[PDB]
Amino acid sequence: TIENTVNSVENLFDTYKLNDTITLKNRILMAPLTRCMADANLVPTDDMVAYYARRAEAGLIISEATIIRPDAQGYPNTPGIFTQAQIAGWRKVTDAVHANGGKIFVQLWHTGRVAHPHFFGGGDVLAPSAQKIEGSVPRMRELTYVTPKAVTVEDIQGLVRDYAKAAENVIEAGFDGVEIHGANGYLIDQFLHHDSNRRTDEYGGTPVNMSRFALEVVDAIIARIGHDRTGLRISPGAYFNMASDSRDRVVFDYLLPELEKRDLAFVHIGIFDDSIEFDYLGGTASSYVRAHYGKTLVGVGSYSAETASKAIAEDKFDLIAIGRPFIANPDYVAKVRNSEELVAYSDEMLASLI
Numbered sequence: 001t002i003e004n005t006v007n008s009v010e011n012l013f014d015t016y017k018l019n020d021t022i023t024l025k026n027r028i029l030m031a032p033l034t035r036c037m038a039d040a041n042l043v044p045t046d047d048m049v050a051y052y053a054r055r056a057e058a059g060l061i062i063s064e065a066t067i068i069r070p071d072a073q074g075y076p077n078t079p080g081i082f083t084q085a086q087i088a089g090w091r092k093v094t095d096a097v098h099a100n101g102g103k104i105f106v107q108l109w110h111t112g113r114v115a116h117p118h119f120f121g122g123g124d125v126l127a128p129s130a131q132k133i134e135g136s137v138p139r140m141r142e143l144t145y146v147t148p149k150a151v152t153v154e155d156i157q158g159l160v161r162d163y164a165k166a167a168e169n170v171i172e173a174g175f176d177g178v179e180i181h182g183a184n185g186y187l188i189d190q191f192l193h194h195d196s197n198r199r200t201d202e203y204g205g206t207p208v209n210m211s212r213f214a215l216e217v218v219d220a221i222i223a224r225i226g227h228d229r230t231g232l233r234i235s236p237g238a239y240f241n242m243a244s245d246s247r248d249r250v251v252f253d254y255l256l257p258e259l260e261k262r263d264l265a266f267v268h269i270g271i272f273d274d275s276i277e278f279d280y281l282g283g284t285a286s287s288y289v290r291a292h293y294g295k296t297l298v299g300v301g302s303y304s305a306e307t308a309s310k311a312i313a314e315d316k317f318d319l320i321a322i323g324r325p326f327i328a329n330p331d332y333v334a335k336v337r338n339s340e341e342l343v344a345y346s347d348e349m350l351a352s353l354i
């Protein structure tokens with residue numbers, strides 16, 4: 001059991017060969033963490049360069065979610081990678097991480113129905129279906145979510161194009177690869193769940209159809225940058241801006257073996273506390289995926305170094321992403337290596353980019 005922790009987490013420091021292109025120096029990933037600190041042009045700042053550079057002891061950094069085009073924006077100051085200036089800003093980040101002996105993937109984002117037109121000149125919010133989420137944008141004054149426009153198949157083609165163009169830009173910006181943000185209720189996840197996907201065309205209504213958009217995005221990105229540089233984050237369990245539906249499981253039962261055919265760099269779970277069991281998945285999100293997918297898996301969500309080490313020892317997943325503790329402890333890896341006390345995260349830490 002994971003709770004029966006032991007007095008060594010040596011396995012976290014194992015070298016891990018993702019594939020013939022990339023070997024990680026340890027099993028510890030910096031989880032993607034939106035910080036809302038990019039500039040008015042959504043260009044990474046020199047403060048963001050320093051922030052990522054000081055975490056280069058991680059085996060791999062996954063960047064904050066990075067938007068693929070303007071109508072993807074749902075939160076303030078989230079960086080993009082669709083303009084030349086954005087590419088140049090990210091190149092400073094990746095050069096600094098590499099110079100510090102690290103590796104970094106960008107996380108490519110479209111928020112779908114969680115976008116807000118305040119950020120993009122009053123344009124249409126896009127989603128699989130005209131199903132609005134509840135509420136308003138967090139930490140902003142009165143930006144109520146709107147009913148999305150159900151994308152047309154031409155919109156879908158343009159979105160696939162723009163994911164692929166972003167992936168090309170990512171390589172120009174010097175990243176080691178891309179994590180596709182297929183998780184946490186955002187655009188790709190919206191196609192994979194019945195709450196958000198009420199379509200009756202070739203993108204809805206069956207597991208094959210509901211998986212089609214995700215697989216088209218994956219395949220278009222692989223065609224641009226290669227499978228060894230492409231990972232995917234997924235949320236089989238509904239929990240953020242997503243209502244649950246008992247039929248969603250069979251979508252993922254179809255998707256996961258299809259993903260295995262693409263020989264991705266990794267699949268990564270998107271969850272906050274992986275100790276939570278989901279009724280519809282027969283247990284935890286990671287155990288569900290591990291039962292349906294036989295290649296490298298990144299676990300995440302309320303793990304300590306000790307419980308992550310135990311889970312990996314027990315073959316539950318291969319790599320551990322660490323989120324909140326990497327905000328509270330820039331030197332997380334060194335402190336874990338040296339058995340030093342770690343500071344607990346508090347939400348108040350988000351005000352500071354350190």
Ligand SMILES: Cc1cc2nc3c(=O)[nH]c(=O)nc-3n(C[C@H](O)[C@H](O)[C@H](O)COP(=O)(O)O)c2cc1C
Binds near residue numbers: 035181272273301
């Ligand atoms: C402030 C904050 C921002 C986040 N932003 C993202 C994001 O950009 N992309 C994403 O996929 N997950 C995001 N997450 C989720 C984390 O990647 C991670 O799954 C979560 O924090 C659980 O891991 P932890 O317990 O180690 O923090 C965010 C989490 C937090 C706390």
Ligand SMILES: CCCCCCCCCCCCCCCCCC
Binds near residue numbers: 034238239240272276
């Ligand atoms: C945007 C990143 C930071 C978000 C902070 C607020 C928390 C969002 C995630 C909530 C995690 C708990 C989910 C409750 C869902 C029920 C599932 C069983």
